């Protein structure tokens, strides 16, 4: 939180107000806490809800943070007994605390190369765009944007997902559709970690003959 430095250098001011965008973004997220009449009525995202609710349990955040200390992608078995896939997508904690807080914690701080400011803007923008999506959809977005999940990330998920070999080829060749049929559920943010659940569709029935009926 508290910025100690009050330097007058122009590059510092840019880092400051860019850092304030980070503090403000996090603060926003913390505040969050024909015959169709014959169809059924079910809550599709009940599965994702239950998961994000399990996250509120203490220690659950740590088991994730523990499992993801060394690597970015890891499988975690939850306290209830279900196995879910977790992944780190961006490491801002390490950049901010290891490269910025010790400098800014001091009276007079100096930044020489301006490229450092730009590199900071590059990493920080993805968080800000994720914050913007959630604030206009009350934490439930669909489809899932490249801000929420780049294709490199999404395809890394599909290959590691516990699905059949046939489904992997299917989902991979039509990723843009799965995005449209997926929900990104904001969950919690505590213990200097932010997490959000992504509900992914899995297609249990494939290649049976379909036919479409047009009437007039």
């Amino acid at each position: 939180k508290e910025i100690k430095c009050n330097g007058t250098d122009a590059k510092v001011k840019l880092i400051k107000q860019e850092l304030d965008k980070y503090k403000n973004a996090v603060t926003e997220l913390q505040l969050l806490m024909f015959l169709g009449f014959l169809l059924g009525v079910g809550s599709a995202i009940a599965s994702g809800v239950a998961v994000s609710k399990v996250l509120h349990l203490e220690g659950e955040v740590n088991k994730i943070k523990s499992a993801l200390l060394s690597t970015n992608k890891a499988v975690v078995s939850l306290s209830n007994g279900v196995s879910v896939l977790t992944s780190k997508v961006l490491d801002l904690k390490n950049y901010i605390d290891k490269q910025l807080l010790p400098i800014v914690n001091k009276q007079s701080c100096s930044i020489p190369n301006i490229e450092t400011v730009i590199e900071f803007q590059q990493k920080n923008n993805r968080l800000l765009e994720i914050t913007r999506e959630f604030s206009v959809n009350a934490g439930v977005t669909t489809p899932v944007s490249t801000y929420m999940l780049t294709n490199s990330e999404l395809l890394s998920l599909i290959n590691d997902m516990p699905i059949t070999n046939d489904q992997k080829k299917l989902m991979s060749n039509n990723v843009q559709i799965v995005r449209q049929q997926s929900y990104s559920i904001m969950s919690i943010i505590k213990e200097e970690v932010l997490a959000y659940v992504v509900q992914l569709p899995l297609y249990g029935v494939i290649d049976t003959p379909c036919w479409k009926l047009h009437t007039s």
Partner: antibody
Amino acid sequence: QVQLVQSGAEVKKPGATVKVSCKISGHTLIKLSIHWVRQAPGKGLEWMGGYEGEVDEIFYAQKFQHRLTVIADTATDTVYMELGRLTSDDTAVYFCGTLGVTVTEAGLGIDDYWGQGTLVTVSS
Amino acid sequence: EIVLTQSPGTLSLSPGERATLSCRASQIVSRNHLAWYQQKPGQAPRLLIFGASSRATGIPVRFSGSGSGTDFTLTINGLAPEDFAVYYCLSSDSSIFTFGQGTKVDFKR
């Protein structure tokens, strides 16, 4: 609201030992640096030693390595310095200051906070 | 060990002229770890410049430091009345600080 408070003026005879305090208020000791520097009358400044809260390591100048000691109390936010075998060349004004420079790839940072100075006079 | 020298020892100038103070060390120092301080009589030292060419918070823009390796120069572009004092340059390496003898600034009368 960082403030440095030193002990009162002291007078000690040759061969004795002198303790000077440097109290930190409104700020934590464990994340800042505190160094002791003296000024002989009418001469330049001379470094003696220091403490770096960022790493919790103490540094001494080889000139005084045998007879100077530095103590840091994190619980009282107070730093002391202790010098034995006082001689007439040590009569000077003594300050505690924050010369610690933290260096990362992004830039540099430094504090500039000082006590009021404590005059220590050594004579028989 | 690390030895520092300053030239001149005493500088006498009028307000509004450019003051150039030299600081030379016995060996190469890292630009990040060199610093410049100011002392007036009866005061504790004041930090002016640090990391060679980086000014501290609240110091006027007329003060500027530069240098590398063994030769460093503190430049005051237009002396103000409250600049007349003692100026020490400070070296450091592996948290081992070393002060020069200082260049004093005097009134040209």
